[PDB]
Amino acid sequence: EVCSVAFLKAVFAEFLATLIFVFFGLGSALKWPSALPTILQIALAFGLAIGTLAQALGPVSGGHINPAITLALLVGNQISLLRAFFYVAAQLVGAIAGAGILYGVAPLNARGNLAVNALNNNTTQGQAMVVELILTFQLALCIFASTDSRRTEPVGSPALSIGLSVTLGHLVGIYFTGCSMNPARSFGPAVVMNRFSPAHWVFWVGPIVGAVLAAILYFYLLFPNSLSLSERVAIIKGTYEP
Amino acid sequence: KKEVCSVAFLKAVFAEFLATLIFVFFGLGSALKWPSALPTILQIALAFGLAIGTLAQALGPVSGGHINPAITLALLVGNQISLLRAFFYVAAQLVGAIAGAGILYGVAPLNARGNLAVNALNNNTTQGQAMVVELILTFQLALCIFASTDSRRTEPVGSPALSIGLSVTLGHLVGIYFTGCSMNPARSFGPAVVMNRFSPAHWVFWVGPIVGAVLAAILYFYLLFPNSLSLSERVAIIKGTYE
Amino acid sequence: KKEVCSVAFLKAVFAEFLATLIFVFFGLGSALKWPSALPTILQIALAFGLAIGTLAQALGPVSGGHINPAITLALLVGNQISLLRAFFYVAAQLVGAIAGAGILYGVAPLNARGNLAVNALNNNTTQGQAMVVELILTFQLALCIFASTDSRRTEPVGSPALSIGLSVTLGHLVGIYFTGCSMNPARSFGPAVVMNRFSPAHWVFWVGPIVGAVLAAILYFYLLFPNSLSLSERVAIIKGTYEPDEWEEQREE
Amino acid sequence: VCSVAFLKAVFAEFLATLIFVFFGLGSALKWPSALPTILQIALAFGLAIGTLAQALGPVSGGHINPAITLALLVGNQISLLRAFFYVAAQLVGAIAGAGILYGVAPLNARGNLAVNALNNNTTQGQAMVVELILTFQLALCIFASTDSRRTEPVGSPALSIGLSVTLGHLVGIYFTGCSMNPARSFGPAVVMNRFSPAHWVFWVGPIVGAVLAAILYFYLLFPNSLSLSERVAIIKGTYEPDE
């Protein structure tokens, strides 16, 4: 699995995409002096960044760009444990790259905090944890319905469908935590500007738990695969034919 | 007599509960009176509609994806579903819709609470003038739901869930300006359950959607594109004993 | 003669009445001068284009779904419909537009009703200018509608209604700063009759869209993607008889 | 070149780039009635590509962008002469679209005919790197959407490509007014006759970014598997596979 050429491209796509998703998301959501971006303006910019990069590099990788989605798929028994590590690693590296790039290009009067995930003052950690859970649970459940081959119903454009599920997440999430759902999107500018949150665990735990719940529902409860124990073991190592 | 014993039904009812819940949370949540930056009309419209259009793509394959008692009844009135299904489905939708606003209650900050974005009248416009519009909104929506769930279509549908989502966004682009846009009893009931009794124009948000949805269910499923079946099988549907 | 008296054609023009009722109801309804919060340019444009795009999906299989006498009278010149199909459609679109505009006045209160989202020129844009815009605003819309609904298309069309619907929106994002964006003569003639006001340049709102749509047909149908049919076949279409058909139903095998 | 299909294709590149530059620039004028918002301008520019793809895409390929034309020629999808006359058509079409706007636009809203303006806090070097990333991502979507080898559900190539221009504009506006299109930069620059010393960025930025995406797509990521004779034949303009 790991030594093949398809595995090299697939992981590169996750790095490359997460770079651009983070560059465009953060770049669009800076406190620009020309005109401070609106809540819709931001929410579409992320959900067009996910919807565009799904269409481009979803053939190459799978189009995760998201540790939570990757980990949800892993817990759902959709991917190998080796993949999960490299994908997640590529995403986390890519996010730092994209954040890093933005640091260079943007003028100071815009830059500020590089659009890090700021928790709202009236909002708490335990409150913001349940939001990032939901925000990512619907995105996870949207993805898995949109890219299950067993579906007979008309999917249409799962690129711009999954894309818009991000824009849905941002029009609520901007208020509670500045929106995250992607642990890499949080971890990117936190490393570049070199400043973590006290509630940075929320941006990991919330989405990673939120996404895994969707996977537990969709892949075991609602739409089971019906495979033997030894069939499932070979999938996680990376030796499934079928 | 029967369609309940199957686990496919058990999943289908829960999927409505689960779906209806999230639509409310995101609809209301996007609609809350945010002091950080109050939501524009276009914003609230998109967030409401993209909630439906995503949930259709997610749980439409599991439950049909009504996410609304108006469509649940207008599918019973159009002869698309049995009695015992629409009994449990609206039972799921309302139960779900309560939990969804109640979680927004359980998380939202007190400065942004505002109203919990509940449906409330315009002072310049009467209860009659508002009852007229809730027909129009759910009519065109149900017409578009029924048209895009019709398997007979040879025309290129392309994207069902996004076109249904953009119908709900079209619904709010004008329907916010009157009552806050119901197009949905569970969306207007669920949050208003956090109080006690009925408000002044509460009947408007039940009759308006259910009537509107049924007029498309007459026009589409009886007049425009009928079915041509016997009363032996039309009764077998309503019981739920059809193959 | 038989084409008209069939039960298929009853629903085929009734849907144009019901569509243009709902289009000019929703479209104009988002563009009122509201007190609560004045609708933005992007908020208007989307509501018009999504009205088109939501109706074209729902009542596309019924009538085809023009919801526009500029579009219908371009199909007649492009040789896609009969002369009695084009006549009865245009009537129901203008009757629908006035029927919708009538229902809109009946709910919108004193304060908000205002001028009922009627079209009007920009103060620095003359009649010599404003017609050239409304041509191009609708030329592009026709070209999208033709290429999206043409069954000769090999490429993946996607969703045809939304693709078309968001060409109306795109028309509004420029059109409002010149006219309030008509692109549809019925959407001008819908409110103008109800509130009982016509301008010194209402000739721009009729001729501009229809001419733009018809000049797209000359390009698309005759230059870009030609037909290859005889003069007898062209006259057969205009009068309203053409074969072969598909799935005529009935027996026997 | 002498063929009838080439005429229509080159004419459609003129006509589309003309209609693109009209709709692109006109939505972002100094409108005294109501100044255009940022999301509005992104959606205007974006949907012009997402509509002219649907219409004139079948005719020409739906380039409307000398950077995308040159990227494909490097990636090995067209002949030398096809690109030459495509670029010429786009650049002329752009000037026509702008020179058309000179007549119809009023004086009070006019502005500078909406030419790309480099944010004066940002340098030449930085603007180039954004314009690269704006156009690299645009082209990298295009090639995947328009790839006939695609097994995945394609969606509407037209719409997903138009929104990559929207996405492009959501960030690019703050740096340059967003170009990603040497003709859209050149077009209004000839009508008003206003060339900055920083005009080279609008050519070099998108072109370099588009070339990288093509090289990455067609050679590295998704290989072709064809001989040099077939590749030279594509550059010279002589090819016909299957029936």
Residue numbers in the entry:
A (entry chain C): 4 to 245
B (entry chain A): 2 to 244
C (entry chain D): 2 to 254
D (entry chain B): 5 to 247
Copied sentences from the primary study:
The flux of water across biological membranes is facilitated by transmembrane protein channels called aquaporins (AQPs).
For full-length AQP5 S156E, additional electron density could be seen beyond Pro 245 in one of the monomers (monomer D), allowing us to build nine more residues. For full-length AQP5 S156E, the limited resolution prevented the identification of water molecules in the channel. In both structures, a lipid molecule could be observed in the central channel formed between monomers in the tetramer, albeit at slightly different positions. Similarly to wild-type AQP5, this lipid was modelled as phosphatidyl serine.
